[PDB]
Design a protein around this ligand. Structure first.
Ligand SMILES: Nc1cc(-c2ccc3ccn(Cc4ccc(CN5CCCC5)cc4)c3c2)n[nH]1
Ligand SMILES: Nc1cc(-c2ccc3ccn(Cc4ccc(CN5CCCC5)cc4)c3c2)n[nH]1
Lengths: 202, 212
């Protein structure tokens, strides 16, 4: 049983999300009183989301049991292990930033009352936290109760455009098939992700 | 001027992207994102897109005949065919930069446990094909990966949308007992830059020692 709350200034972006799990999307601007962003102290390009609005939003939504998830390019890596870890949480709150990010004090303040996880979903830059939220939600929820690269998969027909399914997969020999698949996995891993087997990246 | 075609059995999942595009860029002909329902190319009354894996095992595999027809209609010789997969080459910022100058991206979104490998292998005999992973976690299908790829690429296309960056701060100068680091208000911009650099080094050591 999991509750997921997503906070964003673009709630519409989260529509792709659609009894053992409930997911709610909140418009951050609901906690304003008049602008959610301003220029950075110390200078630099772009804008930073003000801590004040976030503090009030999170005050209302989070408890001490909450795991606060903050997507950011500068985060710890979100991996499959992370997904397994979070899959048994009662309450995830995902704080989606925009512009150049969120004032650091939001996470620091929250960390005094709850567990906080700043995470990156990969080494590329998004325009905001929303797409990362969608990725995180999908990877976690598919694990809720209720390494190596996988090799190629095939289905019917056995011959297509003059391209044959590898004959071993048609042979019915479970041992020879398990062996071939293991080999295909290790070969693909060497080629595409040598780091997974402890080798230098290309 | 970039065309993006996305093929998926869940076209509604890609709704955020098309909304995410400002009208100015579309009307300037800078970008056009089209989403296609894969079932348009099914052959049977049951609109079947999947079938059991050869060699056995769990899950299902998407049919090559359906995908073949779809890509035949949508792709040209100039297409960069992007196929999200947990087993793909890593999609990185360098990739996003490379793809940002492409004329035509076609993103083939799998579901179930993936697409019959002959689809990509056949396509690769007449166009450039890139099987890519967006991170070391498993999704339910290619659609979320397509969203990420589209967003990361398009924000690098003019006017369409190393160490870790350190913390950012804005008003107010004091909030819930926490002060903005005084150096940032010092007006010593050489010192500010060095402070930021050290924050960056520190954060990279703590969170991403792999980058060092
Ligand atoms: N794994 C992953 C996570 C994200 C992500 C998550 C939340 C937000 C909120 C705003 N942005 C946009 C954003 C932020 C910082 C910069 C500036 N930085 C300097 C160097 C690299 C970039 C540019 C643009 C997010 C991005 N992207 N990728
Ligand atoms: N970077 C990234 C990309 C994706 C992605 C992309 C396309 C599809 C199409 C179907 N699926 C779901 C899915 C579920 C289980 C298996 C089984 N495999 C065996 C063990 C590991 C997994 C494969 C595939 C996708 C996933 N996920 N993560």
């Amino acid at each position: 049983s999991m509750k997921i709350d997503v906070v964003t200034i673009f709630p519409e972006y989260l529509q792709p999300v659609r009894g053992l799990v409930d997911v709610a999307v909140h418009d951050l601007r609901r906690w304003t009183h008049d602008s959610v962003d301003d220029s950075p102290y110390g200078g630099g390009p772009g804008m930073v989301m003000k801590p004040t609005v976030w503090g009030d939003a999170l005050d209302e939504i989070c408890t001490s049991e909450t795991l606060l998830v903050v997507p950011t390019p500068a985060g710890y890596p979100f991996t499959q292990e992370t997904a397994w870890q979070w899959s048994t949480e009662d309450h995830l709150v995902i704080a989606c930033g925009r512009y150049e990010g969120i004032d650091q004090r939001v996470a620091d303040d929250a960390a005094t009352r709850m567990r906080v996880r700043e995470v990156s979903i990969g080494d590329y830059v998004l325009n905001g936290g929303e797409a990362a939220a969608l990725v995180i939600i999908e990877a976690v929820l598919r694990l809720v109760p209720g390494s190596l690269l996988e090799g190629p998969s095939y289905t019917r027909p056995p011959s297509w455009r003059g391209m044959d399914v590898p004959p071993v997969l048609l042979s019915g020999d479970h041992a020879k098939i398990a062996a071939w698949r293991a080999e295909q996995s290790r070969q693909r891993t060497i080629e595409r992700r040598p780091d997974l087997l402890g080798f230098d990246s290309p």
